[PDB]
Amino acid sequence: GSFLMLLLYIGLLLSAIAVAYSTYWNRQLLNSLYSELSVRDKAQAEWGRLILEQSTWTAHSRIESLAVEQLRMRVPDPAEVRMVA
Amino acid sequence: PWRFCVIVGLLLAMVGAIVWRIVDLHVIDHDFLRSVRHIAIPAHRGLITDRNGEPLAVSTPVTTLWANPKELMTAKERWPQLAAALGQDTKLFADRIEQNAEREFIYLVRGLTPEQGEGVIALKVPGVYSIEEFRRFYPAGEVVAHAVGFTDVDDRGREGIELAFDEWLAGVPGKRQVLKDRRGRVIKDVQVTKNAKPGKTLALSIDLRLQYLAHRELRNALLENGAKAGSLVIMDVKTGEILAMTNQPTYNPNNRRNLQPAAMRNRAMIDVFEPGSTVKPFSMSAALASGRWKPSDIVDVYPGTLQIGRYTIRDVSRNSRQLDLTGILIKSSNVGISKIAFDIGAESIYSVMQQVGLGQDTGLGFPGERVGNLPNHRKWPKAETATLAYGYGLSVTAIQLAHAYAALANDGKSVPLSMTRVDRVPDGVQVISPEVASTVQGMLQQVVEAQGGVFRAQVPGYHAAGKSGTARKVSVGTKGYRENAYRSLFAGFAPATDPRIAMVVVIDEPSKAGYFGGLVSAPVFSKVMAGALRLMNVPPDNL
Amino acid sequence: YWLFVVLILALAGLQYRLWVGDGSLAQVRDLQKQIADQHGENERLLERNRILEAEVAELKKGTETVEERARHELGMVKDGETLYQLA
Amino acid sequence: LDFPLLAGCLALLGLGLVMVTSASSEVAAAQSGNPLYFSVRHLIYLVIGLISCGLTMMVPMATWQRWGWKLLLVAFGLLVLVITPGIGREVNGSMRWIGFGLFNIQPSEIAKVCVVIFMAGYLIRRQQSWMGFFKPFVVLLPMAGLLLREPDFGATVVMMGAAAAMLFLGGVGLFRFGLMVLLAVGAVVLLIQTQPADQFGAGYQLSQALIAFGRGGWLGMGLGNSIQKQFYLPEAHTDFVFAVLAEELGIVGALATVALFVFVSLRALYIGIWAEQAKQFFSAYVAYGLAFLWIGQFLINIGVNVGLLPTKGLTLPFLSYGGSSLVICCACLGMLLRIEWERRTHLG
Amino acid sequence: LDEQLPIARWGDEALLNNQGQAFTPKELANYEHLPRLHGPQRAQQQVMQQYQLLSQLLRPLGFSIARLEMSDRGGWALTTAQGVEIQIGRDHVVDKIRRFVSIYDKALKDQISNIARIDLRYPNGLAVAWRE
């Protein structure tokens, strides 16, 4: 039993040091995750800024006017449409 | 040896003093016991998209300037300098700061562009810092303002989908630890307690092309008819999605300065009205579901001035004596609908009207989404039966009226509404048997196509199927209605051969040209289905 | 042999905290996979908004590519064109 | 052997190992690269301490009676070398360590064990005169003078306290004992005469452990969850390792450690009592001295941690970091297990 | 040592392989027949693989790709050996290719001699411009 007690005690010590190492590792991974989420947040901030700048020029009415004026695009006529199934 | 005893006793006394001190400090003074601070990092909202790929509401970074007044008592001589960068009186700014001197967190300016942020912070006044606060921005502008709503300054939903989906869009914030000081300044960012949850992207079922379209010709209808307000709803019949929906007059969600709440009034959900002659198809559905009536039964409606008790059921047209059920729908004969209701009884009428969804609620959950009222009585008073037959004495909003007409167009298989996009085919309740649904679709097709009905509502290259209507708007105070104030209504679906799109068009108080539904809402009906059927990519069936 | 009970209890608690609690290696793998997927969506979103800035760069100076949106949103066609539809 | 004493001391040893592993990871990672630096070196220190305890168990006791003179000769050599420059590094205001590679050596502990051994070897001779009164003082006064010229006050304090107590066991006077105690106190006060909040600075420790205990709680917040040890305290694995243990194991673990220290220390004093009843005066006296040295170090560490006493950057037996302190503690352990062995020779 | 595969040309300067890393050999003018490929500066990772997959997918159509272009916007433009340009569009490239293949096999069997351009930038079908 004495040798069994020694083995159980050293196993407990190994488990405890593993718990400490794993808790520190989890703290490090949480820090890394916060870093990546900050990167994602600033990337989506840039995306939102770009969308805000684009929306003032790609509006529906403006693009309709552009299509009908510059390239002389016209709304399609259902009489002349090749319906294919 | 007693030296043993005295040494052991002294050791135990010191140990007891130590343990007494530690137990005193740990628990007794725990509440009393600048070093470390536990802070919360905010999260950003989700993305609201149309059916396929177009964003409808986005969060944009805005530099927001805040200050810590505890660091700002040292700026007694600097508040006049800082007030110029703000735009407020120096004495007034000093009063504003001093009344909240005890406050630790105070906002100076929000909604400011970053460049002005660096310009203001160039003064380098202690305690002032810049944060990248996210402001919600709406690419579609006023087009989808009512269907998406808006958030408040606190980045919390207030109306529309924003308020309806706060738990889905606005993710839960994250927790962080910092090394604060006496002035609140952070030395080192300590381990994050719990990280923030990103907001989930919600894909609406509204198609922005159809929404742009409907909005365009509906404001065209208002300017052409000179009416006070109006609304329009698009519905897919196979899935119940609200493919498009708009109200007027609209508001710009990105510029909310002095918007009067009736501009915020989402009439497709808040405004109640009697459908009028719009509910004739459900009456016919009940009549043909009972099996007593047939589509080819001649009904006499002369003289068109039927008397019921002390009430008079006036009819619009008194120049037709014998009229079939299709003729009843075409002429909107109140006498004919009254007679058929008397023959069939209002029990089945109310049965089919609750089954389709009229006057009930649907799983949408919007702020101020009204319920309507379809009265239910154990008995059936004759005047009540007549009013239920021809529409009056009842209140239904446009959204569930569109749902009912979609159910009619969906072979009676009513499907619950889903403004969010639907991924799996829903299975609803077979409200109306297929034979009755097909017959009703046929009568609606003849109503829209045959002469004497609504020629303006015919959709080129497509078999339309719709029914007009007019509502005598209800007046508050005077029991009844208000003179010369009628709402034009039209509803239907297309193509009549195999429906895929439903519609309800409502225009409030057209007082210039006329009040007839087929006169006002029919051309809008035809235009919106022309565009929507072209965009929905279904094959035309006329040439 | 009294002290075995305390050692068993302590080892059980330590293993529970090592396999279940916030310090568990299971949470280690959870956070590793979460960060891997997070980085993947970072790189995808960076590619996405880089394409976005490129297209907005073209939008302010050109017009030949606004036809993409003008004929996707509206289905518009030029005069000398024929629509072949599949349904 | 001695099952209960060995179990208690090994509990202390393993608990110190886990405590240093849990408390030194942040500082090791930051200013040393790999996060497992102090812990991995502490494991090696632990194993060599076990080997040294075995070696002291394999070397007879009469050797300390006869071969102690060379032990104090090398102790004097190390105590000279700790003050000379070139073979010593000055860290945190004091050049206490001497380096031979990866094993920094603090000579205070070996000096303490040697001076205890010679005090016992003198007191077995002159328990029963003024010449004896003056003779014992030349044994330890150079120790106190050297260790106080070096910035090391806790070692001199534990030296004086241990010496006074372990004279108090084995022949005490009525007023002359107080006389020698007061002259020793006067000498240390003269040495003090020769050489005489702050949370934003490096004085964070004075209130850090106080607020930590305030937030500790009855059961604690589990293994490695203290928020006052991640870069808040440098070398927290040495001075405030007991505060870290308190935050990590609550009132339960804190009182368990305090009571187990008390148990092992009173067991040391009580096995010294047995040796006294076993007619082994030298063994009894060295046991009393070692036990009182341990209790002095333990009490001063807990007192500085709780805040009842001024700052004393001294290690904790079997818990704090440091190769020299743990090696000497293990050697003392081997000495005590011997004392048990010689006492049991007639029993078994 | 891996040998580069002269399968594609980046503009008129560089040569591309299956992976498409930018390499330039001893002689450049030798490959008149080799297809021309264009793209943004950060596009030596995707244009070549898209060209290869499109060629493999359209091989039963009897179409050999002549020039492939990518605007920085990402919209793809394709030109074939018969001289007709195709505006595939930004996204949904494989869906649009399947749609165009079906439409060509159904209602564009022999109409291969009077098309100015084929525009796939539609969510449902395509538009064909005609030449006299």
Numbering used by the authors:
A (entry chain D): 12 to 96
B (entry chain B): 12 to 44, 51 to 560
C (entry chain E): 7 to 93
D (entry chain A): 20 to 147, 152 to 219, 233 to 384
E (entry chain C): 142 to 273
Sentences from the paper on this structure:
In most bacteria, cell division relies on the synthesis of new cell wall material by the multiprotein divisome complex. The FtsQ-FtsB-FtsL trimeric complex interacts with the FtsWI complex and is involved in regulating its enzymatic activities, however, the structure of this pentameric complex is unknown. Since the divisome peptidoglycan synthase is essential for cell division in most bacteria, and is absent in eukaryotic cells entirely, it is a key target of important existing antibiotics and new antibiotic development.
Here, we present the cryo-EM structure of the catalytic divisome core complex FtsWIQBL from Pseudomonas aeruginosa at 3.7 Å resolution. Taken together, this shows that FtsQ is tethered to FtsWILB via its FtsQβ-FtsB interaction, while FtsQPOTRA and FtsQ™ are flexibly attached in the current complex. FtsL and FtsB have similar folds, each consisting of a long α-helical coiled coil segment, followed by a short α-helix and a β-strand. FtsL and FtsI form an extensive interface in the periplasm, with a total buried surface area of 1035 Å2. Importantly, no direct interaction was observed between the FtsB coiled coil and FtsI. Alignment of both complexes on the FtsW/RodA subunits places PaFtsITP and TtPBP2TP almost opposite to each other, requiring a ~130° rotation of PaFtsITP/TtPBP2TP for their interconversion. Thus, the cryo-EM structure and AF2 prediction may represent the inactive and active (catalytic) states of the divisome core complex, respectively.
